[PDB]
Amino acid sequence: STGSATTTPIDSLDDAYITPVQIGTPAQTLNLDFDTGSSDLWVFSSETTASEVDGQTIYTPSKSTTAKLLSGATWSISYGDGSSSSGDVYTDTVSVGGLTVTGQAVESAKKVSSSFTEDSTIDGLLGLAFSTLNTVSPTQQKTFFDNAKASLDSPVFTADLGYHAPGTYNFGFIDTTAYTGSITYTAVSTKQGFWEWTSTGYAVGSGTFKSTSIDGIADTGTTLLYLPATVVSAYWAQVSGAKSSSSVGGYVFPCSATLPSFTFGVGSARIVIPGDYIDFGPISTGSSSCFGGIQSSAGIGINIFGDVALKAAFVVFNGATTPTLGFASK
Known part of the structure; x- marks a missing residue:
């Protein structure tokens, strides 16, 4: 079925x-x-x-x-x-x-x-x-x-x-019509009960790719992308006027900005999140401060590949005896 x-x-x-x-x-x-x-x-x-x-x-x-x-x-x-x-x-x-x-x-x-x-x-x-x-x-x-x-x-x-x-x-x-190129599969740990995997690194905009292991979960029920503070700082440093606001509860940026893309690694493959996906709009109605879609996972205790990341890909949740995740561009 x-x-x-x-x-x-x-x-x-x-x-x-x-x-x-x-x-x-x-x-x-x-x-x-x-x-x-x-x-x-x-x-x-x-x-x-x-x-x-x-x-x-x-x-x-x-x-x-x-x-x-x-x-x-x-x-x-x-x-x-x-x-x-x-x-x-x-x-x-x-x-x-x-x-x-x-x-x-x-x-x-x-x-x-x-x-x-x-x-x-x-x-x-x-x-x-x-x-x-x-x-x-x-x-x-x-x-x-x-x-x-x-x-x-x-x-x-x-x-x-x-x-x-x-x-x-x-x-x-x-559905082989729903994605472009090939699906890259990556290992899953079920030890915490999640679809937990390790990204191979990231890039900000047109910048060079940083090879680094980022353990996190594929979580359709989380809106945003939560990554280590080093990664998130490197992203928002490329947006003039972006800052972390303790009053708002994360990174905000001028609504006048054009955001850079964010790339994450899946094995040797790359998924590109367009900058527009990272804009979550005014912090309050009519504000010119906008809320960022990439936020620090510091204090959450896990990195979360939420909807901001997953919506850039076709994602396979492989529940075979040894589970794996697959990602394709689309």
Whole structure:
């Protein structure tokens, strides 16, 4: 089997991407944030505290003839941005782009933090990291990908995120029309439960490439590119008037700037992030200070190849017995 679903930016900045997901019988379609940095499929639901729901579509398990309470199971998750959610668990039928899993753990939120409530466009998360990170207790649950894997034509999914445009998540096949040149594959460590890999270095604009190992994660659920402070300083040094602002919480730059590209290495290959991808617009409405898309990972404890980086590539998440990542230009 295979599946193929379109993923759509939630706003004009590509702050996140939503993908429609069918849950239950008859189908209840929710727009979920596919997150390769976490391993829980959780939804706004009929159980979510009413004051914490503001515009999201909810899953109502009592209206699904295939929903079953997973008795005694609870979940609770905290993300890198400080947000959180928790609740109880149902199993139900979940379909993505025509690919169906029966008996998927659907984690029903009883509580969500303010950032979730305030984002009316995201109805929940669908985690695509390794199932070792799943938070369900006392019986850890599998991701949608891990449950689909054995049925897929190939044990892979691919992320093809758009810049200010829709893109695609495919499951079980590699669309050879969706990228240019060849895919470069690179090793993955699953030791922290992430799609963790080592970039071979970087370049700023038309500058020379710096060969240096940068360990980090491929994380579709993180907006920005978070790299070591040395790398990030070298980037923003090429933008007149850019500075790190402790008040704003990262590098800002004059909105009048034209940003340089940023290149990262994948083995001997190179992925180029155009400068425009690094502009996250005014820090507050009408400001002439703009927020940068490349930020320091200092104090986060891991480098994160988030959407800014991934949207410049066609990315293969290879879930074979030995997982690997692939990157192609597009």
